Amino acid sequence: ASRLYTLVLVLQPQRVLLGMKKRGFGAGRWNGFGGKVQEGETIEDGARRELQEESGLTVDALHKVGQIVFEFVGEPELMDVHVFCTDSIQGTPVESDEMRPCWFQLDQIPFKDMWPDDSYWFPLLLQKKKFHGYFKFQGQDTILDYTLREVDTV
Numbered sequence: 001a002s003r004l005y006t007l008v009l010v011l012q013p014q015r016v017l018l019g020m021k022k023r024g025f026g027a028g029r030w031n032g033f034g035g036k037v038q039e040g041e042t043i044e045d046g047a048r049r050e051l052q053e054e055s056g057l058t059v060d061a062l063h064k065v066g067q068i069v070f071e072f073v074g075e076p077e078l079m080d081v082h083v084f085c086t087d088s089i090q091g092t093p094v095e096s097d098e099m100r101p102c103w104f105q106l107d108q109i110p111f112k113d114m115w116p117d118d119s120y121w122f123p124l125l126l127q128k129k130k131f132h133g134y135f136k137f138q139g140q141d142t143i144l145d146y147t148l149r150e151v152d153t154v
């Protein structure tokens with residue numbers, strides 16, 4: 001009982017792109033760009049699609065950086081999130097009714113206004129490490145338990 005998702009971080013040498021989510025689950029937080037993988041779609045194709053749908057950017061090159069499983073108490077389905085990173089994009093970020101993309105300098109990442117798990121795995125992302133994570137949440141604010149380990153292959 002896990003559902004496949006993707007999550008894309010646009011990480012350049014001095015800045016990262018995040019999107020403020022305007023509606024529904026995780027509204028009011030800065031997010032990477034992601035969503036559910038579709039029937040007959042590869043995980044990487046889904047990641048590329050989600051980046052365009054949510055940011056307006058076209059990815060030229062993607063690489064795998066992690067897998068994170070999320071459990072929410074009272075929710076039967078686990079979220080199996082495949083995380084990707086790129087430095088190489090085309091287009092300019094687009095604000096839509098759903099998302100407002102903004103660049104952040106790396107020492108100004110707005111963790112207080114991000115999912116709480118990000119504090120744990122962003123240090124690894126920023127140093128080009130790969131990882132496997134598991135986070136058990138109660139509601140959107142509380143991590144009950146987690147695991148996080150660096151890996152050589154995602």
Ligand SMILES: CCCCCCNc1ccc2ncc(C(=O)NC)c(Nc3ccccc3)c2c1
Pocket residue numbers: 005006007025026030031032033034035036070081114115116117118
């Ligand atoms: C169709 C997707 C429904 C929204 C998923 C809400 N659950 C959830 C739980 C914990 C999370 N922790 C971190 C982040 C993140 O962006 N860190 C930079 C999350 N963003 C995320 C956005 C889309 C798909 C998958 C993950 C995230 C999302």
